[model samples]
Target: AANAVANICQATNTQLYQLVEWAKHIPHFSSLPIEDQVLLLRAGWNELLIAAFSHRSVEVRDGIVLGAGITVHRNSAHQAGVGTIFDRVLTELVAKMRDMNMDRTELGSLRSIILFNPEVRGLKSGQEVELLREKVYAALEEYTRVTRPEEPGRFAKLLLRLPALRSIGLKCLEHLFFFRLIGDIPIDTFLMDMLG
Candidate 1:
């Protein structure tokens, strides 16, 4: 019966593979009650088809969250990103890797999700992870550049040690905490008015 359903969803091959990739490592897959797993899978299959065929708009995103056992309208903003990140990225990764999301019934996709998102394990030396770190720093730098008065000193201090930025991005993302948010107040008043 599962195989038959998998066959029907074969049109979502890419998504299926992604789900398998996730199932291979994440622990939470098995941690959930069997009923939840069944519910998640059934809903996930439908959500996969929906996400694949439709543009990933906020509305669609909200629908996906709702389908994943989350109350879309009621959750606090800070708590919202965690479940959505799981539903969107972790689940999608598993779906993309397995060739069939239905096949990984016993599998968990937590480790892969952690490693991809925020795992900091096995980096024996900070310098060993330079490239990923640079990607993170540059992302932060760009963010700071775009955000006016982002406090240069603070950003400088906030920079993670080089070579472990991938891990840093992972940490920030996992914590669901990111760098400072800046307001939109203009800096033009000082420059334009002073120049006049």
Candidate 2:
């Protein structure tokens, strides 16, 4: 049963890989200094994972499928040591995203916005990161205006989810889902290998 949780790590790692792939395509993302790049990714990867999971798992009834066939149900989340908090927040997150019925373009742009965040402290390229964020903002807003013309509130509401995404505390996720999988190995070191 615990190995099933271990498999969750495998799929979650895949999500991180997918994030790096997608980030590199974000116009000037690679232009940011490697330090800033890693920092932004470090700060936002969990949000990216949650958003991506919410997007892909809309059809699944029980729990969000992490990857492969692993479905973490609330009934067993406590036994698995993830507890009910992460499950409930994640569950509600999925429902909110589902309510918006976003398209690929919307999710992509919104994710870019999440990744380009410049306020995480210690950023040497905060200005550059902010510039990139502004572009994603412009793009997402213009996109909805063109595609969702009648839904005047769509763009505003989409950005609102950022606060909700940020509510998932950083260490909360690491401790809940990954502490067991990565004994003694620091998340930064583990993440660095994946980032590189």
Candidate 3:
């Protein structure tokens, strides 16, 4: 279990840096002021991470296996006393993903929308960020319409997921407290820093 915890921590760190790199390459993201970019990332990183990692979630199993081969079991988590909230959130997220049959293209567009948040409290140019956010939304909308014409409300459903993502992120951040209590398992520093 200790080894598994260490592996989970490492996986979280690696995936977070990967997320940073992914954000770095976003077309309009790097074009923004550094301060705004940082602000946007800080505001949305946790939510984005949750969504990006959702691809690995197994709702029926009530768990998610991290990229590093660590299976975080919901029953184990429940015994640990922290599973209820996080597992429930993850369960819903996975179900939604399965129902939508979310593909990589749709996920990429959602990440872009989250990364270009205009409401990230400290953004220097909120309007500029809003412009970028709108662009992503428009692109996603057009792509969905062109690619899946029969699914008229697909885009709307995707957009509506943002709030739930935010809520899940908040709850996951809270779960870190319980994770930290487990002996000798280093809490994911990047997660702490990002959530802070």
Candidate 4:
């Protein structure tokens, strides 16, 4: 039965593995101070996955074919009591990207922007993150300017969505998907292994 195979919880963990792989490839990313690297990654990983998911969604089909072939049919998700994030946040996020007519590179740039917050909670190495954010926005701005000349202020609009993403942080996601599915599993320890 479809219920037997439904998989957003497992899907989320698999996504993190891919994200870690992608994060490692960011230029000079591994060179960051170890603490900051983990801190920034912890802050960054949650947004990228959700943002990327919304970007990849295909609506009113069998299910949401969110990033990299992961699909948990809406029926299962709503049944699991995870409807609010999917219904509201993801819905609006999907439309915003659609409205912008974004490309993969543009979304990729947005992930980098999410990855390096510049002024984060309380980690070290603020300047390095600042420089990375500078480079990311610089590249994104140039790319949008070249590709979307008619839509001035497109870059600003693209950036505006990230603050919304920031508010829906890792803990919220963990509570929604992870805790309900894998309750009391100490996913922090799990992430230590996964992130390593």
Candidate 5:
């Protein structure tokens, strides 16, 4: 199971890197300085991963599908020594995402906003990134307003989840480290790139 988990992690990392590459083609994202773009990808990778994974997740009672054909129960994860905090937070995160019923456009729009964060340290062009971020933010607001007429606060609610992403992401890294240490599995290069 550890080996399978490691392989799945590798595949997920590869897919995320591909998505980052694809992000470079987004008109607003492409307008940023290349340095800022890299910084945003580094800073926002985990958030984007959480959004994407949770969006596509297949739930099985109190567990989620972590890999293609792999379903990990919360209790099983606890038995494996994973922290209770992660299990609880992930449960909430997944549930919130499932309820959102966001379409692909909303996902992409949200991802764009996350990837252009102006708060990333050492950003060479923070102001430009901020402008781009604002543009994406406005677009997302309009999208939610038009698409979900009954839910006016949906955009704000989505933005409010950003901080939780950091918490969940930190626990996720610890979860990966647990597998690496227990299974003695080598971390894949791309996975290391993201974590490093």
Candidate 6:
């Protein structure tokens, strides 16, 4: 039964439907001028953010970003063999980001910090699960408050609960941890510590 479900879900057409649903937001994007299409694609992040804000859903927004991080890290690892390629790409990306205006760059970097931390795995154990949940929820609140406080508190109140929150937490950590900028602060090397 599980294999049957997987077979149905893994069908190429079913996957394509998800992408189509995502792209449905574009109103006749294909008809747009080439430059306009490119610009629109570049600015789609803003659109996605607006969707998250409008939907008043942190999970959807953060989940999208988390998925993006996984895809990014997986692709980088695939291309660069998980060596200096990963670090160099990240460094260059950060440099480009830093070149942006201060507010924009810092905001981008903060999101990067959260996404790259790679320690936010899904709570597998009963130990401190709620604590991690609270931290993530608080972070989302902070994100909205700092970014768009005019919105109502109800938005923050509606926490999206995925059944696989623990899995999400762990995957988030793995994908995001590499992007975090290490400095004087004592960073948690959870994976490294586990290795020892």
Clashes of each: 30, 0, 0, 0, 0, 17
Sort by TM-score, top down from the best: 3, 2, 4, 5, 1, 6
Best by TM-score: 3
Shift of residue 3 alpha carbon in model 5, Å? 7.1
Per-candidate Cα lDDT values, in order, are: 0.34, 0.74, 0.75, 0.70, 0.69, 0.33
- Candidate 6 lDDT tens digits, 5-124: 323224434433533454433323343344433433333332232222212222222111222222234343444343343343333332322332224323332322222222323323
Better of 1 and 4 by lDDT: 4
Candidate 2: stretches off by over 4 Å: 1-11, 81-83, 178-196
Tell me how far candidate 2 lies from the true structure as C-alpha RMSD in angstroms: 8.4
Q: On residues 1-196, what C-alpha lDDT tens digit does candidate 4 reach at each position?
A: 2233335556666777788878888766777887887887887776887777777763534344544444656665676676666565555577777766778888888888888776778878889888888999888999989999998999998898887776765434645453234332234335463755
Q: Write the per-residue lDDT of candidate 2 for residues 1-196, one digit (tens) a residue.
A: 2223345456567767888988988889999899998998888888887787777777766566666655555655565566555565556667776777777788888889999998988899999899889999998989999998999999989998887777764535645563343322344445564755
* Residue-wise C-alpha lDDT for candidate 1, range 1-196, written one tens digit per residue: 2223233234335455655454433443444344444444443443333332222223333332322222222133234455544444333433333322211211111222222222233333324233433454565556555652545653353332112323323433454321011011123333354655
TM-score of structure candidate 2: 0.79
**True-vs-predicted CA distance for residue 26, candidate 2, Å:** 1.8
For 1-196, candidate 5 gives per-residue lDDT tens digits of 4245456567666777677776877767887678877888888876776667666663545665544454555665676677474465556667777677667787787777778788889999999888987888888899888889999889988776677776776766654434333233233433563655
lDDT of 3 by residue, 73-182 (tens): 67756766877665765766777887888888888898898888877787799999899889998999999999889999999988888888877777776654354333
Candidate ranking under lDDT, highest first, comes to 3, 2, 4, 5, 1, 6
Candidate 1 versus the native: TM-score? 0.25
What are the TM-scores, per candidate, against the unseen true structure?
Answer: 0.25, 0.79, 0.81, 0.76, 0.75, 0.23
lDDT of 1 at 145: 56
Q: State candidate 5's TM-score.
A: 0.75
Model 3 residue 181 lDDT?
33
